[PDB]
CSV table of C-alpha atoms and ligand atoms in Angstrom, one decimal:
chain,number,residue,atom,x,y,z
U,1,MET,CA,-5.9,8.0,-3.4
U,2,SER,CA,-6.9,7.4,0.3
U,3,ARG,CA,-7.6,9.3,3.5
U,4,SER,CA,-5.3,7.2,5.7
U,5,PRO,CA,-1.9,8.5,6.7
U,6,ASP,CA,-0.4,5.0,6.2
U,7,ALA,CA,-1.7,3.0,3.2
U,8,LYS,CA,1.3,0.8,2.5
U,9,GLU,CA,3.9,-1.4,4.2
U,10,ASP,CA,7.4,-2.6,3.3
U,11,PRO,CA,9.0,-6.1,3.8
U,12,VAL,CA,11.9,-6.7,6.2
U,13,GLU,CA,15.4,-6.9,4.7
U,14,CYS,CA,18.2,-9.1,6.2
U,15,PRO,CA,20.5,-6.4,7.7
U,16,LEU,CA,23.3,-8.9,7.6
U,17,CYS,CA,23.5,-9.8,3.9
U,18,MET,CA,20.7,-7.7,2.4
U,19,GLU,CA,17.8,-9.9,1.0
U,20,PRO,CA,14.1,-10.4,0.9
U,21,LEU,CA,13.0,-11.9,4.3
U,22,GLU,CA,10.4,-14.6,3.7
U,23,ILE,CA,7.2,-14.8,5.8
U,24,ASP,CA,8.5,-17.4,8.3
U,25,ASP,CA,11.9,-15.6,8.2
U,26,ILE,CA,10.6,-12.3,9.6
U,27,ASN,CA,10.9,-13.4,13.2
U,28,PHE,CA,13.7,-15.8,12.4
U,29,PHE,CA,16.5,-14.5,14.6
U,30,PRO,CA,19.3,-16.6,16.0
U,31,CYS,CA,19.1,-14.5,19.2
U,32,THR,CA,16.2,-12.9,21.2
U,33,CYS,CA,18.1,-9.5,21.3
U,34,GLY,CA,16.7,-8.5,17.9
U,35,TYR,CA,19.9,-9.3,15.9
U,36,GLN,CA,18.0,-11.2,13.2
U,37,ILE,CA,19.5,-12.7,10.1
U,38,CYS,CA,18.2,-14.7,7.1
U,39,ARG,CA,18.8,-18.4,6.4
U,40,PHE,CA,22.0,-17.8,4.4
U,41,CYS,CA,23.3,-15.6,7.3
U,42,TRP,CA,22.4,-18.1,10.0
U,43,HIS,CA,23.6,-21.2,8.0
U,44,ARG,CA,27.1,-19.8,8.3
U,45,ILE,CA,27.1,-18.4,11.9
U,46,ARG,CA,25.8,-21.8,13.3
U,47,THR,CA,28.2,-23.6,11.0
U,48,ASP,CA,31.7,-22.2,10.6
U,49,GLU,CA,31.2,-19.9,13.7
U,50,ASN,CA,30.4,-20.3,17.4
U,51,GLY,CA,26.7,-19.8,16.6
U,52,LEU,CA,27.0,-16.8,19.0
U,53,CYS,CA,25.4,-13.4,18.6
U,54,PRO,CA,27.6,-10.8,16.9
U,55,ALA,CA,25.3,-8.1,18.2
U,56,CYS,CA,24.9,-8.9,22.0
U,57,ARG,CA,27.3,-11.8,22.2
U,58,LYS,CA,25.0,-14.6,23.3
U,59,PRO,CA,24.4,-18.3,22.4
U,60,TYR,CA,21.3,-18.5,20.0
U,61,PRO,CA,18.3,-19.9,21.8
U,62,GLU,CA,18.1,-23.5,20.5
U,63,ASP,CA,20.8,-25.6,22.2
U,64,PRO,CA,23.8,-24.2,20.3
U,65,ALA,CA,26.7,-25.9,22.2
U,66,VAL,CA,25.3,-27.8,25.2
U,67,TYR,CA,23.2,-25.4,27.4
U,68,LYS,CA,23.4,-25.7,31.2
U,69,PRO,CA,20.9,-24.6,33.8
U,70,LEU,CA,22.6,-25.3,37.2
U,71,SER,CA,24.1,-28.7,37.6
U,72,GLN,CA,26.5,-29.6,40.5
U,73,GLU,CA,28.1,-26.2,41.5
U,74,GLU,CA,30.6,-27.6,44.0
U,75,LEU,CA,30.7,-31.2,42.7
U,76,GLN,CA,29.9,-33.0,46.0
U,77,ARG,CA,30.9,-36.4,44.6
U,78,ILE,CA,31.8,-39.0,47.2
C,1,ZN,ZN1,21.2,-12.6,5.4
C,2,ZN,ZN1,21.8,-11.2,20.6
């Protein structure tokens, strides 16, 4: 009953377990490559797993193991 070509919108669905993504869960991905999961999917990857990305193979952005920028590369030491 409208003149617009798009008068509706669907919610996102966790493509890992299949569930209703909450509002703050929409952009809740453990990785910035898009591979997004819900809370029941991330509560297991960052727990009994290496908190890594099963889609691009990367450490979730949030200090997963230790994180290292570029400390001593040759270890000068004394
Ligand atoms: Zn899920
Ligand atoms: Zn990723």
